[PDB]
C-alpha positions as CSV (number, residue, x, y, z in Angstrom):
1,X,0.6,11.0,8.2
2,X,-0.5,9.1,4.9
3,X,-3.9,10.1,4.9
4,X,-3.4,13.9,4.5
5,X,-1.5,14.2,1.5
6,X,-3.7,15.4,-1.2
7,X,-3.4,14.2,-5.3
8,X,-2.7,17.5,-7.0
9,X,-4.0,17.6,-10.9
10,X,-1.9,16.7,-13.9
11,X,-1.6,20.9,-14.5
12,X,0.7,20.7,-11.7
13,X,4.1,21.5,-11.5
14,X,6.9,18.9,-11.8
15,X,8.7,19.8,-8.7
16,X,5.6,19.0,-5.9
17,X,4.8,15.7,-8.2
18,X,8.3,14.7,-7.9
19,X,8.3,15.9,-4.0
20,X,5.1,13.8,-3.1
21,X,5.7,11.0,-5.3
22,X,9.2,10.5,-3.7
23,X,7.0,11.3,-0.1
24,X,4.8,8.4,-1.2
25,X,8.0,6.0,-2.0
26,X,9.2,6.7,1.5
27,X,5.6,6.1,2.8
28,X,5.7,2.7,1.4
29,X,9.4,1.7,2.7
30,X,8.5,2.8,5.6
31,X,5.2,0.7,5.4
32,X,7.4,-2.1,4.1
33,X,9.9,-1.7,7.2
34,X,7.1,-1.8,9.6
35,X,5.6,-5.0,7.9
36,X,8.6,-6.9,8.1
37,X,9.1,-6.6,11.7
38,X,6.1,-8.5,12.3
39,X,8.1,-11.7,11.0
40,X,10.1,-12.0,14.4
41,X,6.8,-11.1,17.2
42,X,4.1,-13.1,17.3
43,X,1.6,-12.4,20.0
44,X,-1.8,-12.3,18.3
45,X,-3.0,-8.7,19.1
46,X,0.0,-7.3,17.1
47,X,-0.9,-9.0,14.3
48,X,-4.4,-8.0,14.8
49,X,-3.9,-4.1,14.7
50,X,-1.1,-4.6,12.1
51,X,-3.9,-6.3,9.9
52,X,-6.4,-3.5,10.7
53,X,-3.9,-0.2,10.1
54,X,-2.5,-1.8,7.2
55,X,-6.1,-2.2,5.3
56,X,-7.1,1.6,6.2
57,X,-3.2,2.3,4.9
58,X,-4.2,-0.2,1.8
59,X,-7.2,1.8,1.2
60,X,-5.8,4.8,1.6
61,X,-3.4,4.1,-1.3
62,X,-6.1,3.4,-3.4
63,X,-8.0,6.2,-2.6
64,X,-5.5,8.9,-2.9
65,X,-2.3,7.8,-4.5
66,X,-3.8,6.7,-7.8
67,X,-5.1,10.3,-8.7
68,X,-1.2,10.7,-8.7
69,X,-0.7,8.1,-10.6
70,X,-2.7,9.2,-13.3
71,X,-1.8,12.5,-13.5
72,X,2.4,12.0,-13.2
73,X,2.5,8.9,-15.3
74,X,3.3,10.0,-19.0
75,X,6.8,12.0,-17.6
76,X,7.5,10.3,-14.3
77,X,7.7,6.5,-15.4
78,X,11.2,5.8,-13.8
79,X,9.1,7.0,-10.6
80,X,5.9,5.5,-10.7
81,X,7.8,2.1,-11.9
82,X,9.8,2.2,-8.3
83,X,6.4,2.8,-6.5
84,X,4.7,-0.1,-7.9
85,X,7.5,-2.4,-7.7
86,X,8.1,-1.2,-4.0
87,X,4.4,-2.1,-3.2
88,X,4.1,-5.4,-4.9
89,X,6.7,-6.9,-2.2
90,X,4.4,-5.8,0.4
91,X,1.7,-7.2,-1.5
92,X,3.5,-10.1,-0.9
93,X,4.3,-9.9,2.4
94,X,0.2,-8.8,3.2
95,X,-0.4,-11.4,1.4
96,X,1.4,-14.0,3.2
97,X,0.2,-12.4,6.7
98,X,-3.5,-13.1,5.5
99,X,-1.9,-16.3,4.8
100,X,-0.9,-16.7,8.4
101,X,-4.3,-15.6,10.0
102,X,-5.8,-18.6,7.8
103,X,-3.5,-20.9,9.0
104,X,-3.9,-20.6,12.9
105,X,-7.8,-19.5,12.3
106,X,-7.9,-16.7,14.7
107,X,-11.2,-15.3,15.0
108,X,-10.4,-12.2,15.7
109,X,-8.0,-11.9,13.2
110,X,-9.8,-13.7,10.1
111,X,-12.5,-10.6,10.4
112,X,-9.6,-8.6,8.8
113,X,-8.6,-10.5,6.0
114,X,-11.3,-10.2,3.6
115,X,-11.9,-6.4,3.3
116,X,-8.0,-6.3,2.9
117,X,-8.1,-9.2,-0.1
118,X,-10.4,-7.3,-1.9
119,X,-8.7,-3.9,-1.8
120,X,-5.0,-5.8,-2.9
121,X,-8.0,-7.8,-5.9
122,X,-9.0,-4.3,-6.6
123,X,-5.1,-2.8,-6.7
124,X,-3.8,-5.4,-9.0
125,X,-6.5,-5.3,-11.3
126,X,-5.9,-1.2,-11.0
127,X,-2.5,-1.8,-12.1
128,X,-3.1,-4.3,-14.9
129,X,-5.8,-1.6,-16.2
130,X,-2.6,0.9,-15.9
131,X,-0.3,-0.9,-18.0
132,X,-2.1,-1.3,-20.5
């Protein structure tokens, strides 16, 4: 579902930017949501395909939410201030479930963690070059 939404261009109308902006808030809640559940389960294959979806999902919001971003970010700042705030606890949360694949050093799960590192690096340092 989150890979076919398309950025639009800064042209564009303020209903659909509001429309897929609050699409992409409910896209990371509901990434957030399915993050947390892992908390409760272990069983290392979950956390295996939780690890690969969620990098592909990371990637994905690098690739084609930040186009949004750019374009709705002069009028839309409450909005874009939720999103951002909204992903930085699953930052977090990915973070500490890297954390937790280092800890027991699963093989299978440690090939993972490194692509996903590199695209949260590459996110922050995104949103520190936004700020400003």
């Amino acid at each position: 579902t989150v890979k076919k939404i398309e950025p639009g261009t800064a042209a564009d109308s303020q209903q659909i930017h509001e429309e897929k902006l609050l699409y992409w808030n409910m896209a990371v809640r509901d990434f957030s949501i399915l993050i947390n559940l892992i908390k409760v389960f272990d069983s290392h294959p979950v956390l295996h395909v939780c690890l690969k979806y969620g990098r592909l999902f990371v990637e994905a919001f690098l690739k084609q939410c930040m186009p949004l971003l750019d374009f709705s970010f002069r009028k839309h700042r409450e909005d874009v201030l939720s999103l951002l705030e909204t992903f930085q606890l699953d930052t977090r949360l990915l973070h500490h479930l890297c954390g937790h694949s280092k800890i027991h050093q699963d093989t299978r799960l440690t090939q993972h963690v490194p692509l996903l590192k590199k695209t949260l690096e590459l996110l922050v340092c995104r949103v520190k070059a936004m700020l400003t």
